[PDB]
Amino acid sequence: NSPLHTVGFDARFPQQNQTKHCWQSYVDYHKCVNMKGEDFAPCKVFWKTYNALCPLDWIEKWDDQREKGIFAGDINSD
Amino acid sequence: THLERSRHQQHPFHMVMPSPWPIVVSFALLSLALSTALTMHGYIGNMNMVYLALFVLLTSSILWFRDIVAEATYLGDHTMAVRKGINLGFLMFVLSEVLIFAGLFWAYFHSAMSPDVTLGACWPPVGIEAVQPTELPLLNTIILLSSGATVTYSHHALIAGNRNKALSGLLITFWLIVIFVTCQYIEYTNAAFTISDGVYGSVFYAGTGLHFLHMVMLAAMLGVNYWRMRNYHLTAGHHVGYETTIIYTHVLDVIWLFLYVVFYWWGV
Amino acid sequence: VHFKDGVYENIPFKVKGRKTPYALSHFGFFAIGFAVPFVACYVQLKKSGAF
Amino acid sequence: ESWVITEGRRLIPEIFQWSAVLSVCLGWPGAVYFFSKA
Amino acid sequence: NKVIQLQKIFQSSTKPLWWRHPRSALYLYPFYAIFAVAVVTPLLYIPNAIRGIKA
Amino acid sequence: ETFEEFTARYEKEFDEAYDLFEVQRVLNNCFSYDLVPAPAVIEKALRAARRVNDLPTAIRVFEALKYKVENEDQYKAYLDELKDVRQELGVPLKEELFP
Amino acid sequence: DVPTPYACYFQDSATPNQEGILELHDNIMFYLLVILGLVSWMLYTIVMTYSKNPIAYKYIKHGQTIEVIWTIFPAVILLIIAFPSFILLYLCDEVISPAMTIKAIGYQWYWKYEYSDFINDSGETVEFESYVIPDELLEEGQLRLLDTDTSMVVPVDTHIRFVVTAADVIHDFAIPSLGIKVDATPGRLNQVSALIQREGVFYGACSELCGTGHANMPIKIEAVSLPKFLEWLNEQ
Amino acid sequence: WLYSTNAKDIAVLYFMLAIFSGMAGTAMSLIIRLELAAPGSQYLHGNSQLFNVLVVGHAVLMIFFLVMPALIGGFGNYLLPLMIGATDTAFPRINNIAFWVLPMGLVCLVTSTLVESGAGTGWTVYPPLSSIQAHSGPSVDLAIFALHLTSISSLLGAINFIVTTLNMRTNGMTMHKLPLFVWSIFITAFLLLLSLPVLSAGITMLLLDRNFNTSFFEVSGGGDPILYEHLFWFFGHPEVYILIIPGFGIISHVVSTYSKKPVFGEISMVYAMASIGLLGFLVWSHHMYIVGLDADTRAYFTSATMIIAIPTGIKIFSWLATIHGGSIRLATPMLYAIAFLFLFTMGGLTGVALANASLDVAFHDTYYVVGHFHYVLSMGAIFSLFAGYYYWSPQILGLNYNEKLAQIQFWLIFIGANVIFFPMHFLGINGMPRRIPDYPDAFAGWNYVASIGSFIATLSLFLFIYILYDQLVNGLNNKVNNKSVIYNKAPDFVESNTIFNLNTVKSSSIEFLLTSPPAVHSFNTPAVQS
Amino acid sequence: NALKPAFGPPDKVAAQKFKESLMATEKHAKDTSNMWVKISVWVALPAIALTAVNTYFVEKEHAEHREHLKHVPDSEWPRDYEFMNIRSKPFFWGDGDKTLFWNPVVNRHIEHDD
Amino acid sequence: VVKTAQNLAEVNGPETLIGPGAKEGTVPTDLDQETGLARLELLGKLEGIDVFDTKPLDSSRKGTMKDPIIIESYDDYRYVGCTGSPAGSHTIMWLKPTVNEVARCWECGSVYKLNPV
Amino acid sequence: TIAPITGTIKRRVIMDIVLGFSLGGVMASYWWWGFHMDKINKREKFYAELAE
Amino acid sequence: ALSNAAVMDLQSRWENMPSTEQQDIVSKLSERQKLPWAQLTEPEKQAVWYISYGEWGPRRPVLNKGDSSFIAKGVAAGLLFSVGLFAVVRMAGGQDAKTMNKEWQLKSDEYLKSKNANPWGGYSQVQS
Ligand code: HEA
Ligand code: HEA
Ligand code: CUA
Ligand SMILES: [Cu+2]
Ligand SMILES: [Zn+2]
Incomplete structure (x- = not known):
């Protein structure tokens, strides 16, 4: 009887500026699914984080940067 | 007595004659500012009006310095109280010239301490090949460090009383401020990241680009002191056109030693 | 004004002894400084089609 | 046996004239609102 | 060298100071030419550039 | 610093005045302090007007004594203490003159 | 909420994080009236009762026991003011437990909201854009320059976290009734947290300058009840 | 004279530029408040550009071309050599280039408005709005070359003022025995020296982003536009105190002269005036409390902005104690100074509420800020500018100024300018945003009230022009009959009128002991002090 | 005569104290010229001529590394990032000239729209 | 024959404050290459008396x-x-x-x- | 014998600051006890009904 | 001595007295005060007080008798001319707002009252 539910505190990013909370969760989702996706559940917890608090013009931007191999942050741990 | 003493000034301060140099320089900055902000949006077609407006600003300022050299040794109204004013007046100008590099030190630290999301998490960003500090930038330092160690006996041998010793120490100081211009011109062409490669090609080519521009001004200021010492101007006890430049030489061997420890060693 | 100090002499105007009335060259100096935005209000509006 | 009144003769019209000029210097938007509510 | 003779000229001449050297007729006569050129051609491009006509 | 040390500082300065400028000056910074002086001070100020022979600078003494008195009865007690010095010299009050 | 013509106060509160601001501003102006009372009374006793004094008390310069007094007395006043300010500054960024996340991106002349948490039955991030209705396309009853077409709705009595940014020039996200203001710098994204105590529409404005149409983008927020919220969310 | 080097003929050329540009700063102020009198675009047709152009045209002309060249330029170059007894300024030729680069900076600003775009960025020329993607014209390039030519005007005058009052004072005048107006431009010429390189860097980093696409603040590239917010306001709040420390200098002299008393604790007045400039550097983020700064940083800048109320509050309480004990001669410079103690007080308390970081989130970029700084600029730096004229112009020009006509010019300013800026707090406390061409319909109340008072202030400027005209023509006739006031200090209560005429001026500064007007060589032999 | 006695009394001890402080101006400038001439030709200049040829040892191979880059044409250039060529308001002195000076061997600016 | 000063007592105005010639192959020693206003204060500093009153x-x-x-x-x-x-x-x-x-x-x-x- | 009269203005700032605090104090008591407690009484009367 | 017709009523006679007599009557007076006082003439005793401490030249007030009534007669004729100058340019101006004219505001409240906008204070919105 409590439907609404989203990302909690995540005390490593406590201040007002959350410009890297979107980013670090985005890399850690693409690091999980490449470097040993153990199942699709226990690293789509990151997918619930970066689908919130990231604009839908930002997500298609980094989807293009990783498409042409020109993405900034390292997503290939291998 | 009181007849010949009344035929001079009563205060040591110098009252200059009215001369039309501060108005012509003012009509050279307007003709620079108008010809610059027109030619960058088309509106002219060629880079000829800036190449003349910057030329008339250089000539109308070298004729201002044609008056002060005549006002200091052909009429010579620089007394003991006037020379303290010029030495302190330049010392306030060099404070703004130092603090104008704090705007280009804050720009680097705001772009490196909190790294950006558009570029990578690292600094310098991925792909950009940074400048190695164990190479030709170190040669840019040791040339410049010895420059501050070879102008300071060209000043002391001037007071000692021999021209041929003090002139040799100024000729081999003027070449060090044109070797450093050359070896920071070679590095500015054999690099791999432009002015428009994000921020690491931007804050780097302004904190060192402005410092490169001042070394042209220091080599010109070290040029007139070679001309004046050859043409018998600077005495052994009255040289404010030379003690001004030693201040500018050591202070540029201070902000370079911040540029070297930050933009090269701390950057990579 | 480097010579001939006096009451009306330290000003770059010419108040007394003028061939014209002075209030022409006084109020006609500040109205130039008051109608200089309206010519910028004019030629920027006229450039924008409206009148 | 005198000194309280000789200041009281002066200050009592001072604290009334001051509130008269402060309520005009601060409360004058209360007059423009009261008339034209339209 | 040539400094005491230039002290005799620049003192007691009653000319404007920038004119006082003998080698000054061929400095300012070219300089007043190229200054009057370089100060009007920025002003002359102003009313054409306000309307919006460029190269 | 004190009040008795204020009297013997201005009982001296009205004994060395020699001129009209050095009476109206000494009377100016005799009333420009905080307290109004005792009449032993102001007796010398009337006497030092006869040293310089000027009457209206001895009338403004009793015109400034009225302003700096802080209580209307005290103006009637300064005048009553100056029984003789106002009468031996002959300088009148400004209100009795009615100018 | 709605501004009133000829008003002199805040708009009506809708947030405990804005209810504290009204408690802070009235506690601050309680002390800025004693000082204005002291200044404007000293400036009328001195002007009236010393424009007539002819003998100038020109022998007081130092005043040692009164210079020490007006050094610690503004230091006492500002220390009293700071403790409501330091409590409210910390207790306005308690983002510890939100319940819904809303993004809001400003595209230089209009807003764009998106409730991208997958909490509904469709399976997509719901998003829309909100433009001000023009003066030609008005209807008699709308609030001009305040009432847009497709507003943003939120539930009541639940914590909501906004995430505000832009993909164009810098412009602000400001609602006076909720008391939130973050300038939406396009390199970054800020966040505020503010639950709404009572349902009803709130209007806002954009305060940072963005260009030509800086005034033509309001932020209509109409908080609705939660069973009425999920009717709108599952539909649209 | 055209290329003159005389250090006090430049100061009257400065003053023929203030009242010129302050007219255009008022005419641009007229159109803004005329368009805001009613909802709907009345006088401007539908154009929101040319309203955001006439705001930066109005804020640059009033700050950088009215208050700065008259407080620092006008009363600076005339009175800093005179009150220390210097013959001229220290460097006389760069004192001339500090003037003549201002009309070239005036041409570069009017030509920034006539070009097809118009700078629509506001006074704080924010980066992505003023980047080349938004303002594609060359308009704002000329609008920052004007700020380049003005920055090198105020810098090259500030170097001239530091090295003047450091070694060109007279014999017995030590630094402790200095006038308060000399100390006030001496503190101010250090802040102009320590803040203008931060501006002239941050402006150039904006010029390189447009014409050279170097991305100092362009987002595609990692250039954060909050860096310009940090870089401009490190100039911006020192620039704010530069316009008001000479405002504290003139009021410290008009009070001490028209009330025959020295300044109460003068050596404690100079410490408070110097601890504003040192503390002025430690606050710049109170203009950006809501850009996304972390909570400990907002907790610092709300404390260090509160500390500025301590030395400013000392200076207000020192001025109250100075006029307390002494006589008061209510001439028109004293009327401007006695209203400076009230209108700067109400504009200083409004900044205290604004200084709170947790309260500024309901106040930033509303009209509660615009009603705040006009109470300390249009009433703090203009009242002292009007007081500075009426206190010294019978000495400078030599002609009196029809005193009983100058009383109504003050009274039409005080009740005039208070009708604009007092309801401006009501628009901001209700939620009216800043820099809008037209507002929502619930703001037609106080925007009509604050528009009537714009004409009362503008008619006051026109009355000032006639006083400025009546001072020149038949100004000599005003000191032979009973129009004006001649002696600023009336004689004491026991001063004879025939003995007052021997020692007339009881001044505590040099500039009233000179001849009226002063000679071109006013000190051909040095003066001696005690 | 009237208004002309003299100017001032001779202090006569500041001289041979100011001049005696000026005799040490030469005496101090002799040693501090000798102190700095040895470090500028036998300390600093050994550091110049030793490392200038060390720097000219990496010039012959880094220009060879520049000769390696245009040896192969390499149309398969690494496809530089989003920030590597900012071109809003293209440059006014040249056609597509990136800076005031750049060798084309390492500043190619290959456009890949695809 | 203008005859430069070499002492404070013989000045007669700016005609005789020129100073002697400059030698070649050496520095000016500040006594032989002054002009006429700093030349005057140098003659004062070579004596005890300061010329400008402070x-x-x-x-x-x-x-x-x-x-x-x-x-x-x-x-x-x-x-x-x-x-x-x-x-x-x-x-x-x-x-x-x-x-x-x-x-x-x-x-x-x-x-x-x-x-x- | 006139008694020594002194301190006529020391009693005119102690009795002026006291009537400067007590003239803004009953100007600021109207704000917090008569205006701020007017709006905050209208709040917690209105929010008393929205639990019913 | 000195004539009674000379210094009688030296209040209005001192102004518009000629300058060569104005400094002459004090030279007749200042010789006479080298005498024990209360022997001087009683209008003469008044007359020296107007010379040394009168309201003439110095000790003139900053505003005359007819100035405080002139200041209020220039301020109120500047207000009632500025607002008169306000209506002239307010007349020659643009068209009024469409939604301002009192017909929206009767039923924009019905939009607000249906949504409970301002529960305290007021949402009345009626400005014509
Ligand atoms: C120098 C400071 C200064 C002064 C004096 C003024 C004066 C005035 N200003 Fe301005 N103003 C600013 C600085 C100043 N302003 C700034 C920084 C901004 C913000 C810009 C932006 O937002 O980016 C601003 C913005 C601003 C706005 C914009 C609000 C918003 O953003 O929407 C408005 C509109 O109401 C306004 C109005 C006025 C008015 C009515 C005056 C009136 O006071 C003018 C009438 C007063 C005079 C008549 C006296 C001055 C005239 C003289 C020539 C003086 C003569 C005296 C001597 C030389 C002896 N100002
Ligand atoms: C030039 C004049 C001037 C002066 C002197 C000041 C002085 C002050 N200003 Fe202001 N200010 C401006 C002009 C000025 N300001 C401008 C132009 C802007 C920005 C507009 C824009 O962004 O475009 C601005 C912006 C500005 C802001 C930014 C708000 C916003 O944009 O979001 C803030 C907030 O902190 C602020 C506060 C202050 C404070 C605390 C002082 C203090 O120094 C004031 C000190 C004075 C007093 C406090 C009163 C005297 C004291 C007493 C009578 C006794 C003591 C009493 C107690 C302590 C209670 N100012
Ligand atoms: Cu978006 Cu203003
Ligand atoms: Cu500020
Ligand atoms: Zn004295």
């Missing part, structure tokens, strides 16, 4: 009109600040003691006779 005024006695304070000038308007009799008594007050008219110090009481020279 001295605070006599603030040890008050001085009546029978026994004033003299202030040696070269014009008729030498401005005087007379902050007190032990030079710390009152605030400053500026005076212009001209020829045949003393100034009288309305606060302190000093008298200043000019002695114009």
Whole structure:
């Protein structure tokens, strides 16, 4: 009887500026699914984080940067 | 007595004659500012009006310095109280010239301490090949460090009383401020990241680009002191056109030693 | 004004002894400084089609 | 046996004239609102 | 060298100071030419550039 | 610093005045302090007007004594203490003159 | 909420994080009236009762026991003011437990909201854009320059976290009734947290300058009840 | 004279530029408040550009071309050599280039408005709005070359003022025995020296982003536009105190002269005036409390902005104690100074509420800020500018100024300018945003009230022009009959009128002991002090 | 005569104290010229001529590394990032000239729209 | 034959302050290459006397009109600040003691006779 | 014998600051006890009904 | 001595007295005060008080008798001319707002009252 539910505190990013909370969760989702996706559940917890608090013009931007191999942050741990 | 003493000034301060140099320089900055902000949006077609407006600003300022050299040794109204004013007046100008590099030190630290999301998490960003500090930038330092160690006996041998010793120490100081211009011109062409490669090609080519521009001004200021010492101007006890430049030489061997420890060693 | 100090002499105007009335060259100096935005209000509006 | 009144003769019209000029210097938007509510 | 003779000229001449050297007729006569050129051609491009006509 | 040390500082300065400028000056910074002086001070100020022979600078003494008195009865007690010095010299009050 | 013509106060509160601001501003102006009372009374006793004094008390310069007094007395006043300010500054960024996340991106002349948490039955991030209705396309009853077409709705009595940014020039996200203001710098994204105590529409404005149409983008927020919220969310 | 080097003929050329540009700063102020009198675009047709152009045209002309060249330029170059007894300024030729680069900076600003775009960025020329993607014209390039030519005007005058009052004072005048107006431009010429390189860097980093696409603040590239917010306001709040420390200098002299008393604790007045400039550097983020700064940083800048109320509050309480004990001669410079103690007080308390970081989130970029700084600029730096004229112009020009006509010019300013800026707090406390061409319909109340008072202030400027005209023509006739006031200090209560005429001026500064007007060589032999 | 006695009394001890402080101006400038001439030709200049040829040892191979880059044409250039060529308001002195000076061997600016 | 000075007693104006010739192959030694205003103060520093006066005024006695304070000038308007009799008594007050008219110090009481020279 | 009269203005700032605090104090007591407690009484009367 | 017709009522006679007599009557007076007082003439005793401490030249007020009534007659004729100058340019101006004219505001409240906008204070919105 409590439907609404989203990302909690995540005390490593406590201040007002959350410009890297979107980013670090985005890399850690693409690091999980490449470097040993153990199942699709226990690293789509990151997918619930970066689908919130990231604009839908930002997500298609980094989807293009990783498409042409020109993405900034390292997503290939291998 | 009181007849010949009344035929001079009563205060040591110098009252200059009215001369039309501060108005012509003012009509050279307007003709620079108008010809610059027109030619960058088309509106002219060629880079000829800036190449003349910057030329008339250089000539109308070298004729201002044609008056002060005549006002200091052909009429010579620089007394003991006037020379303290010029030495302190330049010392306030060099404070703004130092603090104008704090705007280009804050720009680097705001772009490196909190790294950006558009570029990578690292600094310098991925792909950009940074400048190695164990190479030709170190040669840019040791040339410049010895420059501050070879102008300071060209000043002391001037007071000692021999021209041929003090002139040799100024000729081999003027070449060090044109070797450093050359070896920071070679590095500015054999690099791999432009002015428009994000921020690491931007804050780097302004904190060192402005410092490169001042070394042209220091080599010109070290040029007139070679001309004046050859043409018998600077005495052994009255040289404010030379003690001004030693201040500018050591202070540029201070902000370079911040540029070297930050933009090269701390950057990579 | 480097010579001939006096009451009306330290000003770059010419108040007394003028061939014209002075209030022409006084109020006609500040109205130039008051109608200089309206010519910028004019030629920027006229450039924008409206009148 | 005198000194309280000789200041009281002066200050009592001072604290009334001051509130008269402060309520005009601060409360004058209360007059423009009261008339034209339209 | 040539400094005491230039002290005799620049003192007691009653000319404007920038004119006082003998080698000054061929400095300012070219300089007043190229200054009057370089100060009007920025002003002359102003009313054409306000309307919006460029190269 | 004190009040008795204020009297013997201005009982001296009205004994060395020699001129009209050095009476109206000494009377100016005799009333420009905080307290109004005792009449032993102001007796010398009337006497030092006869040293310089000027009457209206001895009338403004009793015109400034009225302003700096802080209580209307005290103006009637300064005048009553100056029984003789106002009468031996002959300088009148400004209100009795009615100018 | 709605501004009133000829008003002199805040708009009506809708947030405990804005209810504290009204408690802070009235506690601050309680002390800025004693000082204005002291200044404007000293400036009328001195002007009236010393424009007539002819003998100038020109022998007081130092005043040692009164210079020490007006050094610690503004230091006492500002220390009293700071403790409501330091409590409210910390207790306005308690983002510890939100319940819904809303993004809001400003595209230089209009807003764009998106409730991208997958909490509904469709399976997509719901998003829309909100433009001000023009003066030609008005209807008699709308609030001009305040009432847009497709507003943003939120539930009541639940914590909501906004995430505000832009993909164009810098412009602000400001609602006076909720008391939130973050300038939406396009390199970054800020966040505020503010639950709404009572349902009803709130209007806002954009305060940072963005260009030509800086005034033509309001932020209509109409908080609705939660069973009425999920009717709108599952539909649209 | 055209290329003159005389250090006090430049100061009257400065003053023929203030009242010129302050007219255009008022005419641009007229159109803004005329368009805001009613909802709907009345006088401007539908154009929101040319309203955001006439705001930066109005804020640059009033700050950088009215208050700065008259407080620092006008009363600076005339009175800093005179009150220390210097013959001229220290460097006389760069004192001339500090003037003549201002009309070239005036041409570069009017030509920034006539070009097809118009700078629509506001006074704080924010980066992505003023980047080349938004303002594609060359308009704002000329609008920052004007700020380049003005920055090198105020810098090259500030170097001239530091090295003047450091070694060109007279014999017995030590630094402790200095006038308060000399100390006030001496503190101010250090802040102009320590803040203008931060501006002239941050402006150039904006010029390189447009014409050279170097991305100092362009987002595609990692250039954060909050860096310009940090870089401009490190100039911006020192620039704010530069316009008001000479405002504290003139009021410290008009009070001490028209009330025959020295300044109460003068050596404690100079410490408070110097601890504003040192503390002025430690606050710049109170203009950006809501850009996304972390909570400990907002907790610092709300404390260090509160500390500025301590030395400013000392200076207000020192001025109250100075006029307390002494006589008061209510001439028109004293009327401007006695209203400076009230209108700067109400504009200083409004900044205290604004200084709170947790309260500024309901106040930033509303009209509660615009009603705040006009109470300390249009009433703090203009009242002292009007007081500075009426206190010294019978000495400078030599002609009196029809005193009983100058009383109504003050009274039409005080009740005039208070009708604009007092309801401006009501628009901001209700939620009216800043820099809008037209507002929502619930703001037609106080925007009509604050528009009537714009004409009362503008008619006051026109009355000032006639006083400025009546001072020149038949100004000599005003000191032979009973129009004006001649002696600023009336004689004491026991001063004879025939003995007052021997020692007339009881001044505590040099500039009233000179001849009226002063000679071109006013000190051909040095003066001696005690 | 009237208004002309003299100017001032001779202090006569500041001289041979100011001049005696000026005799040490030469005496101090002799040693501090000798102190700095040895470090500028036998300390600093050994550091110049030793490392200038060390720097000219990496010039012959880094220009060879520049000769390696245009040896192969390499149309398969690494496809530089989003920030590597900012071109809003293209440059006014040249056609597509990136800076005031750049060798084309390492500043190619290959456009890949695809 | 203008005959440069080499001592303070023989100046006769700016015609004789030129200085001797400069030697070739050496520095100017600051005595042979001055011009005529810093040349004059150099001749003063080679003696004991300083040429430009920098001295605070006599603030040890008050001085009546029978026994004033003299202030040696070269014009008729030498401005005087007379902050007190032990030079710390009152605030400053500026005076212009001209020829045949003393100034009288309305606060302190000093008298200043000019002695114009 | 006139008694020594002194301190006529020391009693005119102690009795002026006291009537400067007590003239802004009953100007600021109207704000916090008569205006701020007017709006905050209208709040917690209105919010008393929205639990019913 | 000195004539009674000379210094009688030296209040209005001192102004518009000629300058060569104005400094002459004090030279007749200042010789006479080298005498024990209360022997002087009673209008002569008044007359020296007007010379040394009168309201003439110095000690003139900053505003005359007809200035405080002139200041209020220039301020109120500047207000009632500025607002008169306000209506002239307010007449020659643009068209009024469409939604301002009192017909929206009767039923924009019905939009607000249906949504409970301002529970305290007021949402009345009626400005014509
Ligand atoms: C120098 C400071 C200064 C001064 C004096 C003024 C004066 C005035 N200003 Fe301005 N103003 C600013 C600085 C100043 N302003 C700034 C920084 C901004 C913000 C810009 C932006 O937002 O980016 C601003 C913005 C601003 C706005 C914009 C609000 C918003 O953003 O929407 C408005 C509109 O109401 C306004 C109005 C006025 C008015 C009515 C005056 C009236 O006071 C003018 C009438 C007063 C005079 C008549 C006296 C001055 C005239 C003289 C020539 C002086 C003569 C005296 C001597 C030389 C002896 N100002
Ligand atoms: C030039 C004049 C001037 C002066 C002197 C000041 C002085 C002050 N200003 Fe202001 N200010 C401006 C002009 C000025 N300001 C401008 C132009 C802007 C920005 C507009 C824009 O962004 O475009 C601005 C912006 C500005 C802001 C930014 C708000 C916003 O944009 O979001 C803030 C907030 O902190 C602020 C506060 C202050 C404070 C605390 C002082 C203090 O120094 C004031 C000190 C004075 C007093 C406090 C009163 C005297 C004291 C007492 C009577 C006794 C003591 C009493 C107690 C302690 C209670 N100012
Ligand atoms: Cu978006 Cu203003
Ligand atoms: Cu500020
Ligand atoms: Zn004295």
